[PDB]
PDB file of C-alpha atoms in Angstrom:
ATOM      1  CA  UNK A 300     -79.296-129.145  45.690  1.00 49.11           C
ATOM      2  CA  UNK A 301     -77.228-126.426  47.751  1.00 49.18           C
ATOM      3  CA  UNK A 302     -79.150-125.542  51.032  1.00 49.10           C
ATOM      4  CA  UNK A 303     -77.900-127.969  53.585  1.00 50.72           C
ATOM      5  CA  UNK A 304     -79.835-130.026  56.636  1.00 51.51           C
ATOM      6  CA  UNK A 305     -78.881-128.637  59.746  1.00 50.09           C
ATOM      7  CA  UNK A 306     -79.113-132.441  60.509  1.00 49.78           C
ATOM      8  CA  UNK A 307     -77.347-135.373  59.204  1.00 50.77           C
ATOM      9  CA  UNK A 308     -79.591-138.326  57.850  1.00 49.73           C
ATOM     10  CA  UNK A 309     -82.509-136.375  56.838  1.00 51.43           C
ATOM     11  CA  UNK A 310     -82.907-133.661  54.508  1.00 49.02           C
ATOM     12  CA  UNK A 311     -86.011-132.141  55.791  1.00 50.51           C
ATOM     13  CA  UNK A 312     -86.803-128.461  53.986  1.00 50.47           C
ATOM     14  CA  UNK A 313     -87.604-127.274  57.589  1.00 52.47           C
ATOM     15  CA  UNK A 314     -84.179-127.661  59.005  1.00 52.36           C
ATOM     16  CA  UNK A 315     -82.053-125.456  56.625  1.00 48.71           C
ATOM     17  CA  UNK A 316     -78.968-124.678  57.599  1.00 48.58           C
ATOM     18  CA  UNK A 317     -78.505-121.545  56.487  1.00 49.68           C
ATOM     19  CA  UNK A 318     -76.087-118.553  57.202  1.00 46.87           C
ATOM     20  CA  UNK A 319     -77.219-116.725  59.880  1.00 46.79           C
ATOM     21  CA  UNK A 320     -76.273-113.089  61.083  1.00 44.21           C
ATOM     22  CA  UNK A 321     -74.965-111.366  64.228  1.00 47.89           C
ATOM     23  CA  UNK A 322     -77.843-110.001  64.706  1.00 45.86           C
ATOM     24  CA  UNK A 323     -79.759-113.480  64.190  1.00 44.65           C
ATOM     25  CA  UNK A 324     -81.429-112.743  60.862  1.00 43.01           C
ATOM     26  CA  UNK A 325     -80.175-115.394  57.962  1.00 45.97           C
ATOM     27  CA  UNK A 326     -77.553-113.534  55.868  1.00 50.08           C
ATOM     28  CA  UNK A 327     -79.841-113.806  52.536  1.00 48.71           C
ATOM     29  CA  UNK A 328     -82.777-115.809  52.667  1.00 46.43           C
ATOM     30  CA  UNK A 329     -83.339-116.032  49.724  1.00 50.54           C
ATOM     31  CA  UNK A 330     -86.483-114.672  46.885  1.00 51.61           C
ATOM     32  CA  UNK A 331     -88.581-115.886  44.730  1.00 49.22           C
ATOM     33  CA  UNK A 332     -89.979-113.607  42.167  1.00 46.33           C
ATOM     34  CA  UNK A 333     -86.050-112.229  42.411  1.00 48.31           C
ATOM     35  CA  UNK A 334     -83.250-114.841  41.061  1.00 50.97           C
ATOM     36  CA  UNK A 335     -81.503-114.589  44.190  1.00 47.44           C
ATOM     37  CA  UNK A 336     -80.230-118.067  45.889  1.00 47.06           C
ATOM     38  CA  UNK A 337     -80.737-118.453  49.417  1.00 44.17           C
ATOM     39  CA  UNK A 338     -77.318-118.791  51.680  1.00 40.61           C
ATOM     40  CA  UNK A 339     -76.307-121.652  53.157  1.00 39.15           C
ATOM     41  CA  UNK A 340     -73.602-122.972  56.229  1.00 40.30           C
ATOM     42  CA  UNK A 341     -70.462-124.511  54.714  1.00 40.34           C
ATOM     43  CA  UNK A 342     -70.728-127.820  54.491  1.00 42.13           C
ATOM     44  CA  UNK A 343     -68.281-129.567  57.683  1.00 41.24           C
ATOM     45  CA  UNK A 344     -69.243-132.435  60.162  1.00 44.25           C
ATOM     46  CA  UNK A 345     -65.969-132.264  62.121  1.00 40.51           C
ATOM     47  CA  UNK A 346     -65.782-132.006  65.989  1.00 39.74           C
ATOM     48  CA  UNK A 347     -65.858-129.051  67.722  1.00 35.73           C
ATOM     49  CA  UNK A 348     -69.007-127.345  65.032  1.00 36.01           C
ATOM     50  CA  UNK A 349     -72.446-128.747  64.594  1.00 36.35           C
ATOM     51  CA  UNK A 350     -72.701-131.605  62.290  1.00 36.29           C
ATOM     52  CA  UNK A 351     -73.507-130.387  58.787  1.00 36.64           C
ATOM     53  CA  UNK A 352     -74.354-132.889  55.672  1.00 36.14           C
ATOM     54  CA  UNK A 353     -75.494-131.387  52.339  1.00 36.68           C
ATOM     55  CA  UNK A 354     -78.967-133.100  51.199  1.00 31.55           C
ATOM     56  CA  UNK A 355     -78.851-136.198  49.458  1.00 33.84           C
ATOM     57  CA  UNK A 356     -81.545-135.498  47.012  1.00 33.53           C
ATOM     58  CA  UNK A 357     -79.964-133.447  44.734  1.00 33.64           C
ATOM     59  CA  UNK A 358     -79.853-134.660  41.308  1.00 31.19           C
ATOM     60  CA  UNK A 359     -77.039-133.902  38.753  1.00 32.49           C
ATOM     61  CA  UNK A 360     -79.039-130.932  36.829  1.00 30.96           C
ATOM     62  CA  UNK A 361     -77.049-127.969  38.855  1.00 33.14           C
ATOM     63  CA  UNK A 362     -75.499-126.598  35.051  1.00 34.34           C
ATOM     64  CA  UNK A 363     -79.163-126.562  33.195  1.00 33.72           C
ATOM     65  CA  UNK A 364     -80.650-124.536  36.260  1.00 32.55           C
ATOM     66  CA  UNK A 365     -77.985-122.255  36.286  1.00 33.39           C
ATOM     67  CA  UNK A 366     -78.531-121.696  33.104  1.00 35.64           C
ATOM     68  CA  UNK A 367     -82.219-121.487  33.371  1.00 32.31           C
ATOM     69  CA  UNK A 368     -81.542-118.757  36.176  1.00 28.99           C
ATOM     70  CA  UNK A 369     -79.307-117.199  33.719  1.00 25.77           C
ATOM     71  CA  UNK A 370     -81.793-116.917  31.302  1.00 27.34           C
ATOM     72  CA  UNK A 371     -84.401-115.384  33.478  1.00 27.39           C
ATOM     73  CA  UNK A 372     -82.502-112.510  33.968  1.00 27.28           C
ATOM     74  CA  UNK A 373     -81.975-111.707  30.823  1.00 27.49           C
ATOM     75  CA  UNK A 374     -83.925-109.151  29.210  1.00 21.83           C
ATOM     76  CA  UNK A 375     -84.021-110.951  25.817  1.00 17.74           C
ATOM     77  CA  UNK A 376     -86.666-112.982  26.620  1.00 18.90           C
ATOM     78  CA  UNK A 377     -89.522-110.870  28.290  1.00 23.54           C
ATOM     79  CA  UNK A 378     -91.615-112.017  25.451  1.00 26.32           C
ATOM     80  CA  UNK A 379     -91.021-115.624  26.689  1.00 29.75           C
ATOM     81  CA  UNK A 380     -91.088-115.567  30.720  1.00 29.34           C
ATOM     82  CA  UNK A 381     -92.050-112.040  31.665  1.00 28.87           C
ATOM     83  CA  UNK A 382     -95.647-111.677  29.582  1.00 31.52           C
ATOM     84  CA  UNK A 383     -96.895-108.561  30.609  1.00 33.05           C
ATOM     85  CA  UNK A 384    -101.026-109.724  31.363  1.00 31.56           C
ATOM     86  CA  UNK A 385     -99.504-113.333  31.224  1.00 32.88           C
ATOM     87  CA  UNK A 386     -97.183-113.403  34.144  1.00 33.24           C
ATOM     88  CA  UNK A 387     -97.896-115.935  36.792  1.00 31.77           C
ATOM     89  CA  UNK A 388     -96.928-115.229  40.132  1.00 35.89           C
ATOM     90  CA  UNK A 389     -95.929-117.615  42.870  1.00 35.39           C
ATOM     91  CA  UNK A 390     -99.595-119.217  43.209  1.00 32.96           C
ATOM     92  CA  UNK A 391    -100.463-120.032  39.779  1.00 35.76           C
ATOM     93  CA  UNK A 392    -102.860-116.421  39.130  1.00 32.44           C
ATOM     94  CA  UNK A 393    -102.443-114.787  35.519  1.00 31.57           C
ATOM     95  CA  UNK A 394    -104.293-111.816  35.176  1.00 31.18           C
ATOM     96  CA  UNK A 395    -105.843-112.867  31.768  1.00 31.76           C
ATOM     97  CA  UNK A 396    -105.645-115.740  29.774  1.00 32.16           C
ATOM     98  CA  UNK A 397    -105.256-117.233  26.482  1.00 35.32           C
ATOM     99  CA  UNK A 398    -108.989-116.089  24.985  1.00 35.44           C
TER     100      UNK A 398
ATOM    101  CA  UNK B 300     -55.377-127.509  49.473  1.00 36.08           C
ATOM    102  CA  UNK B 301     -51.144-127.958  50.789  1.00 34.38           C
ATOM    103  CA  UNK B 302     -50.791-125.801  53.952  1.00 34.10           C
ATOM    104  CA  UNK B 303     -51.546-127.775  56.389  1.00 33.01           C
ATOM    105  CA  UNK B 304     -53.457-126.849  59.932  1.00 33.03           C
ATOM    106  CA  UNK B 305     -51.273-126.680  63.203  1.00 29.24           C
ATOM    107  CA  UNK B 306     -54.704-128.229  65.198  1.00 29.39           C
ATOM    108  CA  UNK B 307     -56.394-131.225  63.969  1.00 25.55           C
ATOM    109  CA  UNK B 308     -60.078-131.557  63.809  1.00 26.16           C
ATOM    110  CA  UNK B 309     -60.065-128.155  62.567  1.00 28.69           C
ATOM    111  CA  UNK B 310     -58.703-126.291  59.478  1.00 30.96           C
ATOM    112  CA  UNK B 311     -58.877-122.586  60.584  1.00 30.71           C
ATOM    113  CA  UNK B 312     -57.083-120.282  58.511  1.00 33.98           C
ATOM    114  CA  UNK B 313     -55.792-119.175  61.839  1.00 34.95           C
ATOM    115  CA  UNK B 314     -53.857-122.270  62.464  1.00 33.76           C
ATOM    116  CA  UNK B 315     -51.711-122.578  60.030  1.00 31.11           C
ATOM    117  CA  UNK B 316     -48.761-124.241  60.508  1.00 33.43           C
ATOM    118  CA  UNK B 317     -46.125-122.870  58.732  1.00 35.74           C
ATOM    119  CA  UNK B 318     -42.708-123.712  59.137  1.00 33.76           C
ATOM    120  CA  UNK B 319     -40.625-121.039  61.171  1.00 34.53           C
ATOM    121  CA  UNK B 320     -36.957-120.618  60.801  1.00 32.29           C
ATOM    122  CA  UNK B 321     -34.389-120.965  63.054  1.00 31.59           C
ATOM    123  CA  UNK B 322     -34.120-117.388  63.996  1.00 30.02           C
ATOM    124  CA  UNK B 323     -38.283-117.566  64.584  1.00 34.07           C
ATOM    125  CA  UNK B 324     -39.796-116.083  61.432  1.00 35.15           C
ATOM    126  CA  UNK B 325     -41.406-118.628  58.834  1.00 31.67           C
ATOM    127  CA  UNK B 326     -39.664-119.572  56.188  1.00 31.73           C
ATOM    128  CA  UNK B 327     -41.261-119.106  53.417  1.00 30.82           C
ATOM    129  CA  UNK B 328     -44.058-116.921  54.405  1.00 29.14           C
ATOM    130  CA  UNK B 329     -45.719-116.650  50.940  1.00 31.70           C
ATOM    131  CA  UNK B 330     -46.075-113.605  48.422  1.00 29.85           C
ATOM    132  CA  UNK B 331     -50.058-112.765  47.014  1.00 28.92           C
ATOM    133  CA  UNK B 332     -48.542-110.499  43.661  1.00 25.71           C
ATOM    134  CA  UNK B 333     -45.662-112.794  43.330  1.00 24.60           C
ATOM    135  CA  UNK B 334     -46.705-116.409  42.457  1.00 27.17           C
ATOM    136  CA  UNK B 335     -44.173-118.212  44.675  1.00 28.12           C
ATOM    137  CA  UNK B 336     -46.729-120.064  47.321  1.00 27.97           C
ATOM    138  CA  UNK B 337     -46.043-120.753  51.268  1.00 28.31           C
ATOM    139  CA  UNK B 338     -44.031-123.517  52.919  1.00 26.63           C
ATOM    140  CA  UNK B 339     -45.998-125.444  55.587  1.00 26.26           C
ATOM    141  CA  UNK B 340     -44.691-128.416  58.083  1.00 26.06           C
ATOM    142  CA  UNK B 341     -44.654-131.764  56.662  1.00 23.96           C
ATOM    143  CA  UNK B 342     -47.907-133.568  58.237  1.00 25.33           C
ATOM    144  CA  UNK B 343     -47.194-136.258  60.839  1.00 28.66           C
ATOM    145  CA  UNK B 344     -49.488-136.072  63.739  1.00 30.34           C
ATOM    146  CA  UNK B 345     -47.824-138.866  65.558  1.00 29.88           C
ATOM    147  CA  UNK B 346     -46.537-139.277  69.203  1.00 32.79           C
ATOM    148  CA  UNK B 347     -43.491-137.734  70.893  1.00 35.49           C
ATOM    149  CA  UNK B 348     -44.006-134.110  68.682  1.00 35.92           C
ATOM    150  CA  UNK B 349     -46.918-132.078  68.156  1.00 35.82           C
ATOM    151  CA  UNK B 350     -49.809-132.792  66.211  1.00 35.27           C
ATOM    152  CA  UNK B 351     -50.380-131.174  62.967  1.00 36.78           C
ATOM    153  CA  UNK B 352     -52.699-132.418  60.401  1.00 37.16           C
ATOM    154  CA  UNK B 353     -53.089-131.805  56.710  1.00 37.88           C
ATOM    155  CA  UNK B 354     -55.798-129.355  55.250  1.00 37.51           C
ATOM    156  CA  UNK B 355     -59.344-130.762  55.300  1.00 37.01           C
ATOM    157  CA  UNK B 356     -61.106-128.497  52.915  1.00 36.27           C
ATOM    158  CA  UNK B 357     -59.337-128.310  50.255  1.00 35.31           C
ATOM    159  CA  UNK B 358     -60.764-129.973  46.417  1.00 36.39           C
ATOM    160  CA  UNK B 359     -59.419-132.057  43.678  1.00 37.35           C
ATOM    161  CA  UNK B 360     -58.073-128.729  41.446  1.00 36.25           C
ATOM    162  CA  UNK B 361     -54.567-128.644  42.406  1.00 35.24           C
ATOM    163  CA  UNK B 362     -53.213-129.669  38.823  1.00 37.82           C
ATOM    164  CA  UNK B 363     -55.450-127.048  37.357  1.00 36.55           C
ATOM    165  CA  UNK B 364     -54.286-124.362  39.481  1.00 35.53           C
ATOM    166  CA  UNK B 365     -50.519-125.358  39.326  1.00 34.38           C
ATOM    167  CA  UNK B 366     -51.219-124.548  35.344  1.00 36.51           C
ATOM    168  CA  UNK B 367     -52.967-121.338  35.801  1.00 36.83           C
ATOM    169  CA  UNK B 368     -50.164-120.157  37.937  1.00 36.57           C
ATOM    170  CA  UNK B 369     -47.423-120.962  35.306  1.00 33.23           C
ATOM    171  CA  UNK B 370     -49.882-119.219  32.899  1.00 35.80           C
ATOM    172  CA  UNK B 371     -49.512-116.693  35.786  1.00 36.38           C
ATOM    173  CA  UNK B 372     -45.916-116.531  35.557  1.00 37.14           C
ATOM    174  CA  UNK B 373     -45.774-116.688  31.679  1.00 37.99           C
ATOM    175  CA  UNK B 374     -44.933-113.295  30.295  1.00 40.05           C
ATOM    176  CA  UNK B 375     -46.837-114.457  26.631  1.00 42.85           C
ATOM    177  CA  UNK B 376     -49.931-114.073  28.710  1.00 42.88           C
ATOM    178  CA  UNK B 377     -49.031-110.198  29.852  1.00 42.43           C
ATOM    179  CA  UNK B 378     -52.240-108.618  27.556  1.00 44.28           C
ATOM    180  CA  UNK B 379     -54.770-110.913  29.829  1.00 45.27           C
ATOM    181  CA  UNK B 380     -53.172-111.361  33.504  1.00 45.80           C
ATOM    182  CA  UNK B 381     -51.119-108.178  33.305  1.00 43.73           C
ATOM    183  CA  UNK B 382     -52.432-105.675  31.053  1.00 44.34           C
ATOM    184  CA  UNK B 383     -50.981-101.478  31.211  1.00 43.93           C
ATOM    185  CA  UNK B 384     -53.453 -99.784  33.073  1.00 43.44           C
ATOM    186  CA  UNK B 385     -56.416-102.564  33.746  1.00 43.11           C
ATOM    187  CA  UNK B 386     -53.896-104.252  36.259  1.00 42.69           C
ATOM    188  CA  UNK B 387     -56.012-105.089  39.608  1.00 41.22           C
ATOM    189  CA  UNK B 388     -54.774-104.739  42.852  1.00 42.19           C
ATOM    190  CA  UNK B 389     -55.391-107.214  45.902  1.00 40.85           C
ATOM    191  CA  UNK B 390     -58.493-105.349  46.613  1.00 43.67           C
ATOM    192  CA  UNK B 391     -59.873-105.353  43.690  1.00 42.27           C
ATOM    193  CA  UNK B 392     -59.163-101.777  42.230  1.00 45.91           C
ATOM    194  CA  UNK B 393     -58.111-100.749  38.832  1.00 42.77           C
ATOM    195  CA  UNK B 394     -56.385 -97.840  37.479  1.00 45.63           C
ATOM    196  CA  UNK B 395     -58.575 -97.081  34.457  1.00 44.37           C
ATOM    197  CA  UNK B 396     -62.538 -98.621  33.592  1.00 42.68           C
ATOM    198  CA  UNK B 397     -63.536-100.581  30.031  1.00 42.77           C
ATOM    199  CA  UNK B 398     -64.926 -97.314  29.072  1.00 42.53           C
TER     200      UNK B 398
END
């Protein structure tokens, strides 16, 4: 819903048009496991720049996931999304399970 | 969102085309601490003059902001927007810390 296509017309995941340093590196690309959002090129289509269109298959949910990324930071609720022998990481692996 | 760009196409905050006085300096060159804004030229890209076009980036917010600044300028408002000693500067610096 943020991360733009670096072309217009399709919003494929593999042409992100993110931020990118000097150096060449992305500015922040972004984590997982961390809360961190990836960074992104403005949004501008105008001559003299590439042509940059924000993806079109964004739904209207942006408030509930910031508040769902709110709420993963919070330390409240390690009993809830931070089980210690129930965590799962990015594959779908707990340590132990229910039993 | 009102100061409008001295190159069209573009809205760098480098071309901004603010109206200079007679002697050469602008006008009304605009004040950060005090709330009075900038003047800009009146936009008319047309033939015979050169062309300067309106802002391009700029949102749907300006009645909102036009109230926060008179909240700005509203000395019943001093203990949040202009408190003693937890005052910050342009660069974000304060005299004193919430401890």
């Amino acid at each position: 819903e943020i991360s733009t296509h670096y072309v217009q017309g399709s919003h494929s995941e593999e042409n992100e048009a993110l931020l990118l340093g000097e150096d060449g590196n992305p500015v922040q690309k972004g984590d997982s496991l961390k809360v961190v959002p990836p960074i992104y090129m403005p949004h501008t289509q105008a001559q003299g720049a590439t042509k940059i269109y924000l993806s079109n298959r964004g739904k209207n949910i942006r408030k509930p996931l910031e508040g769902l990324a709110s709420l993963l930071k919070d330390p409240r609720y390690e009993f809830l999304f931070n089980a210690d022998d129930w965590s799962v990481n990015l594959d779908g692996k707990t340590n132990k399970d229910l039993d």
